[PDB]
Design a protein around this ligand. Structure first.
Ligand SMILES: [Cl-]
Ligand SMILES: [Cl-]
Lengths: 222, 222
């Protein structure tokens, strides 16, 4: 199981400065030495590289665009198969009811339970009712990952109105909730943990120096 | 580093019914599936078996009796060398002021820091002054393991006077404190965590069916 505490997302997509399975493995080692209790990683190759540097539990995803689908976080059984091969402790996937390229959410959950019975599953959701649906499907973890990053939640951010969306998710499900998306400061991390999330995923604020640099530069431009 | 939460001690000495590297590896798997954040294990053979079964961090010891010494938890460099080979994340040793068979406590600490710099060390102590001495030697974790199990702490037990000893250890050192020794109920586990220990080690109450059986039988004999 994932402990209580800080999960560090070690991701760099193509054309990002730190894009490299090797570099993400070193970012994961840094997070481990810093006192992270887990890693979130993208693609089989990054996950396998990370598993050579740290023994921390890994939340695995495959970000891959499909034609005629807005679902890109572990969209089909192809991505699930890669993550089963990766041996990541948790498989995370988009858990919205948006049109998928192949299998439905229900079919992907069943597929993982059948072919990988020792792996836990995490629902990346954008709405309270998506979180409720994920809890009903028996997801081990429910993340706020896609809140503000779907066409129907545009302009919304996790921290808005003292984390009201997170408070609503926590009240609606008894499953372990993960604060993920726009946790950019230790103060924000403390708040979501005090509100009663199981753990919190921090990415950009630790592993995206471009994003951190922009925050420093922006204070002078206000 | 060790997360916050429950560490399960999976030990069975030669005289015990479950004495087996294989059985202790399955006890460790059971602990992992139950939501343990770490394992405490005894001997290289048990540790290697556990570390091929689960990726949980392992606190390694070697219990071995020596002539003309009351120190038996990782007594000499021989035991330290076995634990270095085991690749356990944390090396625990008796951190009492008691004379050791070969190297002193101070010598063994220096030995581990030199020969295994990526390994954390845990002090099994009996007294507040031993906890303070462990902090002086730069121990990563300080456990209450030997409190009541030395010639100079006879009649003392961790839970006595609402864990007064644990309270005294916690306010004496800034290092991460581990509640270990006679933590035998969830109620005790909750209490020591509420008092602000980093984590707690539970052994016999989970992994010694003989000791659990005795507690069931004893309620009818009072
Ligand atoms: Cl970056
Ligand atoms: Cl037993």
């Amino acid at each position: 199981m994932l402990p209580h505490g800080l999960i560090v997302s070690c991701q760099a997509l193509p054309d990002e400065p730190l894009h490299s399975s090797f570099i993400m493995s070193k970012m994961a080692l840094a997070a481990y030495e810093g006192g992270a209790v887990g890693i979130r990683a993208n693609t089989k190759e990054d996950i396998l590289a990370i598993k050579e540097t740290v023994d921390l539990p890994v939340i695995g995803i495959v970000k891959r665009d499909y034609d005629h689908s807005d679902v890109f976080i572990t969209a089909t059984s192809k991505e699930v198969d890669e993550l089963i091969e990766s041996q990541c402790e948790v498989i995370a996937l988009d858990a919205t009811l948006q049109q998928r390229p192949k299998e439905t959410l229900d079919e992907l959950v069943s597929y993982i339970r059948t072919h990988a019975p020792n792996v836990e599953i995490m629902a990346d959701i954008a709405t309270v009712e998506e979180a409720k649906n994920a809890a009903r499907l028996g997801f081990d973890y429910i993340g706020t990952t896609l809140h503000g990053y779907t066409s129907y939640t545009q302009g919304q951010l996790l921290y808005q109105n003292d984390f009201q969306f997170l408070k609503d998710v926590l009240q609606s499900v008894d499953a372990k909730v993960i604060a993920e998306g726009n946790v950019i400061t230790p103060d924000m991390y403390k708040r979501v943990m005090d509100l009663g999330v199981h753990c919190s995923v921090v990415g950009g604020a630790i592993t995206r120096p471009k994003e951190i640099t922009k925050r420093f530069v922006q204070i002078m431009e206000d």
